[PDB]
Design a protein around this ligand. Structure first.
Ligand SMILES: CC(C)CCC[C@@H](C)[C@H]1CC[C@H]2[C@@H]3CC=C4C[C@@H](OC(=O)CCC(=O)O)CC[C@]4(C)[C@H]3CC[C@]12C
Ligand SMILES: CC(C)CCC[C@@H](C)[C@H]1CC[C@H]2[C@@H]3CC=C4C[C@@H](OC(=O)CCC(=O)O)CC[C@]4(C)[C@H]3CC[C@]12C
Lengths: 231, 231
């Protein structure tokens, strides 16, 4: 991500970066890191001009080998698309059932809207299997909890949102602030920089914002002297 | 292949099988055998209830591994189709050039048809690269020789055949008799059978026709007693 700041201290710039991180950066997912580590561990489990020649020959031989990553990525994308379509159909059917239940409850009592909580309770099992399958295939089951899903469904029922709005929240990972408060931690943040944090921003300085299992590297650059002429 | 024979000796049945082999069976291609051996040699290079359990677990783990064969076979089929289309286009252009040359030679002298040999000489380089690429991708370069290709082109010019007829000879492997005489050997054939070859055919007897690098196993069965009734 890129941001524009003024004459500020290193600590102030780090705080601005942190506050923009929640609403800008995608939520951190350790599942991708675990998958990458599992993929990389195979090479470790299997195991200076001459060494350079040998590694160059090994790389050349590998370049002619089978491209295992591409086909499995394509299969994963196809499975994700199929499960997304199934989840969309299930959510549409659930919303149809919600509309039918509201219409039925309309005749029972006029001017007395039903509480959405019981409607969410009755409707959730219909799409529960599809939502769980989509979360499993997208590695998003940890963030989305059953109570959170029920609360979001009730909120959508109160607002009368379209099924697409409900679907898109669980479609892809988004900002940190979308999930619950306990998901993010604002206490373990640390600042690492060779220069003192009391000094102002300078061209070429680089600092790091550390936190549990992940760090953000911030590079500071000076805007070039723009020269404008009337043709 | 399946054939129907009468009361014949083992030698006569083997001779009938051999004479039908040339006009029925596809030409033997050792390139596929070499490819299969190269694929199988990787397992050798890499390397009783407990052993059975271990091999069953290994097979189960392999069943969940990547299907390398399918994607590479699909890529090979796509490449073969693309090269086939390119060869078809090249042969069509070559036949157009042949027709143009014949039309040009018509005005030079009436009633004196040109010899097809020089036309084949002039036309072969146009499609030579495409034909060589197709033979390389189909592992058929050994059987089809340059002189044989020229002779086939001259024969087609004399008969005025369509480009499809010329293409289909090199399209896929066919009968043994299509290629040159030196391709097939009718001297190294041998007969292997536990029973004496002088005896007649009997149900359940099996024999082998051996030849250089390849053998044909022949199984003999008796036609079942068919009972027919008028409803
Ligand atoms: C005759 C009298 C009126 C003279 C008064 C002198 C002031 C104009 C000087 C004396 C002390 C100076 C301050 C001493 C230390 C600091 C901290 C210093 O902090 C930094 O370098 C980090 C912040 C940044 O990046 O600007 C910024 C300048 C400042 C406010 C100075 C601003 C100018 C001050 C007030
Ligand atoms: C009073 C006179 C007229 C009696 C004559 C007797 C013949 C009717 C017999 C005597 C020798 C026999 C032959 C002896 C040996 C052979 C070889 C034998 O060969 C096999 O078993 C392999 C071929 C096959 O599968 O039939 C077949 C029967 C045959 C021709 C026999 C056929 C019947 C023959 C001519």
């Amino acid at each position: 991500r890129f941001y524009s700041l003024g004459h500020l201290s290193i600590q102030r710039a780090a705080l601005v970066v942190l506050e923009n991180y929640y609403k800008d950066f995608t939520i951190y997912n350790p599942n991708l890191l675990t998958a990458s580590k599992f993929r990389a561990a195979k090479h470790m489990a299997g195991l200076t001009g001459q060494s350079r020649a040998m590694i160059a020959a090994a790389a050349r031989r590998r370049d002619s080998s089978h491209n295992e990553l591409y086909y499995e990525e394509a299969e994963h994308e196809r499975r994700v698309k199929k499960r997304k379509a199934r989840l969309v159909v299930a959510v549409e059917e659930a919303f149809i059932h919600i509309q039918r239940l509201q219409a039925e409850e309309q005749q029972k009592a006029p001017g007395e809207v039903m509480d959405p909580r019981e409607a969410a309770q009755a409707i959730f099992p219909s799409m529960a299997r599809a939502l769980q399958k989509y979360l499993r295939i997208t590695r998003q089951q940890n963030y989305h909890s059953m109570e959170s899903i029920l609360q979001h469904l009730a909120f959508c029922i109160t607002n009368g949102m379209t099924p697409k709005a409900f679907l898109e929240r669980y479609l892809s990972a988004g900002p940190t602030l979308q999930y619950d408060k306990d998901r993010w931690l604002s206490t373990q943040w640390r600042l690492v920089s060779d220069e003192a944090v009391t000094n102002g921003l300078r061209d070429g300085i680089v600092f790091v914002l550390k936190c549990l299992d992940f760090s953000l590297v911030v590079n500071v650059k000076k805007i070039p002297f723009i020269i404008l002429s009337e043709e």
